[PDB]
Paper text:
We determined the structure of VpOmpM1 expressed in E. coli by single-particle cryo-EM. We term this periplasmic region of VpOmpM1 the ‘stalk’. Only the region of the stalk proximal to the OM was resolved well enough for model building, as the cryo-EM density deteriorates towards the SLH domain end of the stalk. We speculated that the poor density is the result of movement of the stalk relative to the β-barrels. Measurements of the blurry SLH domain density observed in 2D class averages suggest that the distal part of the stalk spans 50–60 Å. In reconstructions without enforced symmetry, the α-helices forming the coiled-coil are not equivalent in either dataset, as they exit the OM plane in different orientations. In the E. coli VpOmpM1 structure, the sidechain of R113 in one protomer interacts with the sidechain of N155 (part of the periplasmic end of the β2 strand) of another protomer.
OmpM consists of an N-terminal periplasmic S-layer homology (SLH) domain connected via a linker region to a C-terminal OM β-barrel. Here we use single particle cryo-EM, X-ray crystallography, molecular dynamics simulations, bioinformatic analyses and functional assays to show that OmpM1 from V. parvula (VpOmpM1) is a general porin with similar structural and functional properties to E. coli OmpF, with an additional mobile periplasmic region that can bind V. parvula PG and take on different folds.
Residue numbers in the entry:
A (entry chain B), B (entry chain A), C (entry chain C): 100 to 420
Amino acid sequence: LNNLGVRVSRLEDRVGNVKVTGDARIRYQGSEDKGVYKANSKSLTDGRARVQFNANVNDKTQAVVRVKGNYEFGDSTKGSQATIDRAYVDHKFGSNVSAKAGRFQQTIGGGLMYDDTFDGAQLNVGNDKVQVQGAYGYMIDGAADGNSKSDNPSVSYVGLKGKVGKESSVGGFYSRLSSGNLNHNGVTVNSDKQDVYGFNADFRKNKLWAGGEWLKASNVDNSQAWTAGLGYGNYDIAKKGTWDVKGQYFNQKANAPIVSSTWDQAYDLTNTSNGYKGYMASVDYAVQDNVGLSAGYGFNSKDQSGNDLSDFYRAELNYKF
Amino acid sequence: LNNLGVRVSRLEDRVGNVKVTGDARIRYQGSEDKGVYKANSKSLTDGRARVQFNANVNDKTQAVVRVKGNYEFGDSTKGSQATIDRAYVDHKFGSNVSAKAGRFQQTIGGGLMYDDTFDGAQLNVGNDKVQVQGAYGYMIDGAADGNSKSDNPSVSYVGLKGKVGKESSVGGFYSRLSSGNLNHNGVTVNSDKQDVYGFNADFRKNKLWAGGEWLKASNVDNSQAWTAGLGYGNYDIAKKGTWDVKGQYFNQKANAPIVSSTWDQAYDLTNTSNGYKGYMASVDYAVQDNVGLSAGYGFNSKDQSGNDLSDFYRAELNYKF
Amino acid sequence: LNNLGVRVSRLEDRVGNVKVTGDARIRYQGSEDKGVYKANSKSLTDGRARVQFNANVNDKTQAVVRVKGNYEFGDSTKGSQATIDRAYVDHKFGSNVSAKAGRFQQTIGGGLMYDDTFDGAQLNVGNDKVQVQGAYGYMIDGAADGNSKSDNPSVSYVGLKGKVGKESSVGGFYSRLSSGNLNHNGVTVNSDKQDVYGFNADFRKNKLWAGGEWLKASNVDNSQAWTAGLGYGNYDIAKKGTWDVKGQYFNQKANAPIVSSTWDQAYDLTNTSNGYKGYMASVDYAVQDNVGLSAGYGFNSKDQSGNDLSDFYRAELNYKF
């Protein structure tokens, strides 16, 4: 028993404050019309490998550094360059107040508008039912990609979230964006300030999910965007046999601010100049522990004027380390 | 005893599923003529640092992510880029069948044609006496570098390996390459379908080794290539004092497909227009545990028409950690 | 207990020779005149994340591989590319002789002339009170950035460091630079050989600190550069509540070689065409364990001819993993 203890103690020397996690993904995307996912083609098979380091700076602060690498199956034009996707420090100023600083992931509202990289600061105040999240910074991925410091609109976001029921939650959000460059239909246009505001709901009872979100720019005409979805399943990547099915509908207008949505819709501000309106059915199945298989079929895609867009379909495998 | 276990649990809370290995290399290469290794010069001293993360997704699957960085001693034009060299998932479908998916390392035959990065899928059926390996994908390195997905020649490879006696192994392979752009003597030229079939043998007894390989494209004339080598030693980088010496003759014709050979000759389809034929003597010595000094000298280098080529020589330090 | 013993051994299987450390910095720099820190702007808010893998090749050798990623808050033109900052091997040939090989950090003398990346070899002979350091290689960062191998000036450095008390140490250094391209005021000018020689001294009685450094090129005229500073504090980033204040003065002539100094003056060989002469006050405070807030204000900046220069000021937060 004593010797074993010593053999434990030596391990305590080698292990540090950094825990290494990560994930891998092999994805296939396709559409009935060329150009939706890859230029001058109607298919795209790619892969991604992310390695994350969670470091315990001390007992009240932690940092996260994520290194990602994307590649296409057969694309040898350039090497799979490694990029720092996440680099931020998280502080716990008590049992309620929390803070984040650096390049982290921000979700503007319910994720329909933005659920991706964010350069700036974030604050969180709330115990168990009411949570106020306040972020200040700049968007990175999505239609806000390719902009410089002077040309990148600054987001001031405040979001209220309330826990109604056991695992159901409602909420709202109010964001203000300064004038800056945004990617509309493949061209960078300098847009004025916007006052986006929105509401969302997510009711989940015993393997039945019903979610919805509606956002609108206060000072921009025909700029609202909403989504509504239902689903059944108990998906969890860490347990075998856990599946999930869901069907949702997206109706977003021409001027609706959709930089990089959380959902796997193929049409957003970057792709469409006259809105998007259509359904999408997604299926997930944990084939093994920490190995999940996802499929998705987006159909009935149309513009806001009835013009018929192109369908799309995805199939991906995600491995969690 | 309960406390000790708690300690172990804390270690299991921090160690995770990712094991970090890696290696480093300090290499010098030279030749008697300019342009063999570095443009407009006859020497190249460089270094490489690779860090590999091996993650146990579950009992029957693991993933590998390798971050590689090359640099040249004194070259400060660009920072040492970090590139995702390997990113793949390995599945064990029982005691015999195994599968690989993603960006891995493929060895087409004995390694003379290609032993390097590969984007696609691999399926191994093993019996500890006879092994079958089938790969479908794209070459990423060597003469296949600089190609897009629409120009990269797809490879469909099937290889058999028979373990004759103990530690000795023979084998063969048949591969089909689709039409695509290949780098012939620095010029990207489009080539039609090719059928590369070959055999190899590797007889190791006591401390002596004798190997050979022969491959040929069925529908292309003047594409036959082969190598034959003899060596003596017991090299193992993790064991100090283990040495090794070998001498091998390479004879590859003008149109022989040699994308990225597993050996260290400096002439493979990318810097030759009329073939290669010559000897190469290599020496290895584990100076310390996990440290190895390798040297090589390639001489009698000639084209297939009798015209002389440039001799070359290498000296490298490999640190394994 | 046998069940526990199997677990602990498993940990030793999943814990290799690589220990992962790192740091994360969030920095703000600014000046009263545009262009000191960023083009056409008098401010720069950036962040950096470094992850270092310290390996143990064996009991007498150890390698280091550092992956560094910089970004600017709001700059989305390019991803935060990961660069291999350090990649080298450290050998320990007894209790008095040590060596390094690869891309490491070199401090030429006291660091006023250069303390940054270095490609080459280093040898150390130390009597535990008198140390001799000899480095042969190339500069990679600072005014030597953007140079190829054929243009990078080779550096042959021999430095001596003696201890004259409990903490106070004096020393000197002699370095030889070959002909090469160096960045003077944004223009890459070719310069002949230089024979830099210099001295430095440091005294750390109690918490007081008094440091100084002088250096000059033997053949070039108007190349003398010196710094002298005082301070009081016990700054240790791993201890909460440890503060530090200091104030120093720099006097750098027009042709004084300041490639990448170890101090934080905003003016060096890359920014100054007629030298620099001014004061700088720095403050450090470890607000938390492994967290530190640093501030700096450089004022009275002037050319060697009396022409006024801009005043600079910075504030940063450093977290050690």
